[PDB]
Amino acid sequence: KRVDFCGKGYHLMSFPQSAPHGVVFLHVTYVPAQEKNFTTAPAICHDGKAHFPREGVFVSNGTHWFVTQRNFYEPQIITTDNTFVSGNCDVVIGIVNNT
Amino acid sequence: AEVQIDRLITGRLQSLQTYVTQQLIRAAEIRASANLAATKMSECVLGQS
Amino acid sequence: CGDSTECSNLLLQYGSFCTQLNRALTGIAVEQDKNTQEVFAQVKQIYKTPPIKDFGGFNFSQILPDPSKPSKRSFIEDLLFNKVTKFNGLTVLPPLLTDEMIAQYTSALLAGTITSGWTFGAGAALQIPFAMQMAYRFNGIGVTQNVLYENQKLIANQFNSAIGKIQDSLS
Amino acid sequence: IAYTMSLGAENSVAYSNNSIAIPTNFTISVTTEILPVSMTKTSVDCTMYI
Ligand SMILES: *[C@@H]1O[C@H](CO)[C@@H](O[C@@H]2O[C@H](CO)[C@@H](O)[C@H](O)[C@H]2NC(C)=O)[C@H](O)[C@H]1NC(C)=O
Ligand SMILES: *[C@@H]1O[C@H](CO)[C@@H](O[C@@H]2O[C@H](CO)[C@@H](O)[C@H](O)[C@H]2NC(C)=O)[C@H](O)[C@H]1NC(C)=O
Numbered sequence: 408k409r410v411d412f413c414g415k416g417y418h419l420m421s422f423p424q425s426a427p428h429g430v431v432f433l434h435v436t437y438v439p440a441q442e443k444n445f446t447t448a449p450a451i452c453h454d455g456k457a458h459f460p461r462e463g464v465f466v467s468n469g470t471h472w473f474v475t476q477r478n479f480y481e482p483q484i485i486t487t488d489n490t491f492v493s494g495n496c497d498v499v500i501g502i503v504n505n506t
Numbered sequence: 507a508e509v510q511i512d513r514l515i516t517g518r519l520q521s522l523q524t525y526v527t528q529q530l531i532r533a534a535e536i537r538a539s540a541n542l543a544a545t546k547m548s549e550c551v552l553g554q555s
Numbered sequence: 556c557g558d559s560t561e562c563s564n565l566l567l568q569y570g571s572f573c574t575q576l577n578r579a580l581t582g583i584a585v586e587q588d589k590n591t592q593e594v595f596a597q598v599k600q601i602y603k604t605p606p607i608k609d610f611g612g613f614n615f616s617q618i619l620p621d622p623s624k625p626s627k628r629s630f631i632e633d634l635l636f637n638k639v640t641k642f643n644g645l646t647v648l649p650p651l652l653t654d655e656m657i658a659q660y661t662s663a664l665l666a667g668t669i670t671s672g673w674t675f676g677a678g679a680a681l682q683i684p685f686a687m688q689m690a691y692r693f694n695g696i697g698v699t700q701n702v703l704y705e706n707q708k709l710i711a712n713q714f715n716s717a718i719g720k721i722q723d724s725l726s
Numbered sequence: 727i728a729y730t731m732s733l734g735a736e737n738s739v740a741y742s743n744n745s746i747a748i749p750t751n752f753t754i755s756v757t758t759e760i761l762p763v764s765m766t767k768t769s770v771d772c773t774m775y776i
């Protein structure tokens with residue numbers, strides 16, 4: 408998990424090979440590509456209480472909101488199964504209204 | 507003149523060799539410290555450890 | 556010897572010690588240059604901070620570069636430089652990288668980590684607001700991100716006070 | 727020719743307080759690195775030498 412210890416990018420695995428007075432490591436890693444922008448909010452108000460994502464991030468393509476992972480675009484509908492609630496939404500800065 | 511110049515030559519050569527060896531030791535120490543610094547820069551600035 | 560034919564002629568029969576000495580010193584110098592270059596040249600592009608700075612209340616003025624000074628160095632770097640303080644066959648060679656270039660690398664690293672987080676260390680830099688990056692960083696140490704969003708102002712105040720204390724301690 | 731070296735390409739990432747960037751595809755990369763581990767073992771006499 409330590410960054411840049413074995414190759415550039417997120418480390419997947421490695422393979423060793425011999426050399427006349429040393430060793431050669433082949434590092435297999437993972438690199439993302441083809442990004443977009445979308446729009447973001449930190450929490451969502453509903454019925455006067457604030458919801459946060461269990462794991463992921465809120466995005467919107469312009470009209471509707473979804474939850475995704477942080478390393479690969481895969482929208483899903485926002486549900487009580489993948490969000491958790493904590494307190495009324497009067498303190499958080501950047502809250503948006505949705506269902 | 508060759509005798510006295512030879513005495514001076516051997517003395518100065520010995521001093522120079524001593525200086526060079528000390529420099530080599532110090533350089534090795536500095537290189538170790540800089541390797542540690544590079545590791546810290548990679549692991550604590552570009553990510554969370 | 557110092558510009559004497561007799562001394563050089565006498566020394567000529569001692570072998571090739573001096574070639575070895577020169578080789579050792581040259582190796583040391585090359586190692587020094589490669590060493591600093593390896594430490595500081597970590598990024599591939601020179602990132603720049605946006606002109607408008609609203610990082611959720613956090614204040615990075617004392618570490619961001621100052622366009623007023625020609626050195627384009629920050630406050631802390633200037634405090635550091637002012638605190639740290641002939642020819643008989645020996646010379647001093649200049650370093651390959653000037654101080655301006657090192658300051659530029661430092662600014663690039665700092666802008667990249669402020670704007671994109673840790674994403675720019677792997678592939679292409681990805682934008683993200685600072686508060687959400689800090690929420691991720693709390694989530695990474697076993698504290699739910701809920702905690703950050705109800706204590707944003709207090710956390711920002713603590714961070715600013717700590718930075719001020721550091722600058723005062725150095726000064 | 728001689729000149730002043732260029733540190734690298736310069737870009738300004740479009741920071742904003744309500745926008746992110748999420749990847750939509752990936753690539754897999756294999757790199758190599760080389761490390762020396764040993765050198766030749768040598769021995770030298772005295773009387774045969776000096
Ligand atoms: C944002 O995403 C939503 C969800 O897919 C899009 O809404 C759908 O769009 C398709 C394409 O026209 C329609 O067939 C569906 O009926 C829409 N569903 C709903 C619930 O409206 C929306 O078009 C996307 N907006 C943009 C600008 O890309
Ligand atoms: C992100 O920054 C923008 C830029 O100021 C903020 O937009 C302002 O929002 C307030 C309150 O909604 C308005 O009174 C201002 O008129 C807005 N500015 C402009 C230029 O229209 C926005 O609120 C910020 N979003 C956050 C902090 O979540």
Ligand SMILES: *[C@@H]1O[C@H](CO)[C@@H](O[C@@H]2O[C@H](CO)[C@@H](O)[C@H](O)[C@H]2NC(C)=O)[C@H](O)[C@H]1NC(C)=O
Binds near residue numbers: 452504
């Ligand atoms: C999200 O929905 C709530 C609930 O309707 C909005 O709160 C109301 O806002 C109106 C318009 O300012 C006020 O007249 C009401 O008094 C508010 N009610 C409560 C209970 O606070 C809220 O404004 C909506 N969010 C946004 C950004 O419009």
Ligand SMILES: *[C@@H]1O[C@H](CO)[C@@H](O[C@@H]2O[C@H](CO)[C@@H](O)[C@H](O)[C@H]2NC(C)=O)[C@H](O)[C@H]1NC(C)=O
Binds near residue numbers: 615616
């Ligand atoms: C970030 O902190 C600096 C302090 O280093 C603030 O600079 C101060 O600004 C006020 C008003 O602009 C001046 O009266 C002080 O003299 C400044 N201090 C110094 C040391 O110059 C800066 O304003 C802060 N950032 C923001 C956005 O307020």
Ligand SMILES: *[C@@H]1O[C@H](CO)[C@@H](O[C@@H]2O[C@H](CO)[C@@H](O)[C@H](O)[C@H]2NC(C)=O)[C@H](O)[C@H]1NC(C)=O
Binds near residue numbers: 442443444739740747
């Ligand atoms: C995301 O949105 C930005 C803002 O509209 C797009 O525009 C880029 O903005 C940056 C900084 O202002 C410039 O350096 C780029 O040249 C702009 N690109 C354009 C105009 O095509 C940006 O393209 C969008 N996409 C991404 C991946 O950032």
Ligand SMILES: *[C@@H]1O[C@H](CO)[C@@H](O[C@@H]2O[C@H](CO)[C@@H](O)[C@H](O)[C@H]2NC(C)=O)[C@H](O)[C@H]1NC(C)=O
Binds near residue numbers: 441750751752
């Ligand atoms: C993700 O990237 C891969 C490779 O960069 C894409 O696969 C290529 O797709 C094009 C058009 O369909 C083909 O002509 C190429 O031969 C494909 N490459 C390989 C190695 O098979 C893939 O389509 C991309 N996926 C998305 C969703 O953008």
